[PDB]
Amino acid sequence: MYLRYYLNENGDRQYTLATIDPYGKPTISAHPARFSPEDKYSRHRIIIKKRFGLLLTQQPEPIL
Amino acid sequence: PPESVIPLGHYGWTVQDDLICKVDIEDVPYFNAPIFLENKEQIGKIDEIFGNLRDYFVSVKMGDNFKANSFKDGQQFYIDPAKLLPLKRFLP
C-alpha cells in the first residue's frame, strides 16, 4: 500500500510514500499484517521471534 | 414553484462539474436543496457544504441544461428561504 514510514533519533514515526528514507535505509510499511482468527502458527512465530530477539517480552519493559 | 427566494451568496470557483458558491447568509442550506437564480430558475441542487461555521461554501450540481462556464465572477445566487436552518441548530 501507499503509507510507509521511517524513524528519527527519538524512535518516532515519520510518514512518507517513499521506499527509501533520508538515511538510505528502507522504509517500513505502516500497516500491520493481516490477521485470521484461525491461525495455528502461534508457536512457530514465537520460536522465530525469540530466536532473533523481536518478542515483546524480550524488549525493555515500559515505564508506566 | 419557488414562492420566494433570498440571496444565498456569491460566486466562488469551479471544481469539475460543480460550482462552489461562498455563502453570505449565516443560515445553513439543506442538502439536495434547489438553488435558483434571481428569476426563480432552478439550476441545480446542493451537494456539499464545507468550511468554517460562519465563512463557508456550497457545491451545486448543475443539472437541467446548465454549465459551470455559464456563470461568472461576482454572480449571485438565490435559495428558497424556507429550505434553511439556523446556524445555532447545527452548532452546539
Binding site: K25, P26, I28, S29, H31, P32, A33, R34, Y41, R43, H44, R45, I47, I48, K49, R51, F52, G53, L54 | -
Partner: protein, 133 residues
C-alpha cells in the same frame, strides 16, 4: 547499481541463513532453470504456505526484504519442523527477475526434477552446510 553487500544490509533482522553471493547466483539459476516445469515450482505466500502445510518436500526460498515480518515469520519454523531446507535471498526483486515476471514474489518452493537434478542437489547441499542460527 545496487551492490550485493548493501542490498543484504537492507534486509530484515530475521533473514538468516542468508545465501552468500555465489549461492545467490546458484539459487537464481535454479529458479530460472526450474520455472520451465510449471507445476514443479510454486509461487506465492498462500501457495507456498499451502504446499508446506500438506507437506511437499523441496527447498523454500524467502525474500530478505519483507515488512512487516509477521506475514512470513512462521514459515522458517514450519520448514524446520518438516525437515524442508530453506534460505533467504538478498532481495525480492531479484527473485522476480529470476522468474521473469517483473513482480517479485516473497517466497518460492523449488522441487526436484531430472532436468535440474545436479543444480538442485548443489544448492541444497550448500544450504545445508550454511546452517541454521
Amino acid at each position: 547499481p545496487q551492490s550485493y553487500d548493501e542490498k543484504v544490509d537492507h534486509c530484515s533482522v530475521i533473514a538468516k541463513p542468508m545465501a552468500p553471493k555465489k549461492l545467490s547466483k546458484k539459487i537464481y539459476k535454479l529458479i530460472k532453470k526450474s520455472t520451465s516445469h510449471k507445476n514443479y515450482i510454486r509461487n506465492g505466500l498462500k501457495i507456498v504456505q499451502k504446499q508446506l502445510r500438506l507437506g511437499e518436500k523441496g527447498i523454500v526460498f524467502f525474500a530478505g526484504d519483507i515488512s512487516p515480518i509477521e506475514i512470513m515469520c512462521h514459515l522458517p519454523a514450519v520448514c524446520e519442523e518438516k525437515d524442508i531446507p530453506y534460505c533467504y535471498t538478498p532481495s525480492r526483486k531479484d527473485i522476480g527477475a529470476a522468474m521473469g515476471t517483473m513482480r517479485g514474489c516473497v517466497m518460492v518452493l523449488v522441487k526436484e526434477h531430472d532436468d535440474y537434478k545436479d543444480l538442485f542437489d548443489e544448492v541444497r547441499g550448500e544450504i545445508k552446510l550454511l546452517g541454521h542460527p
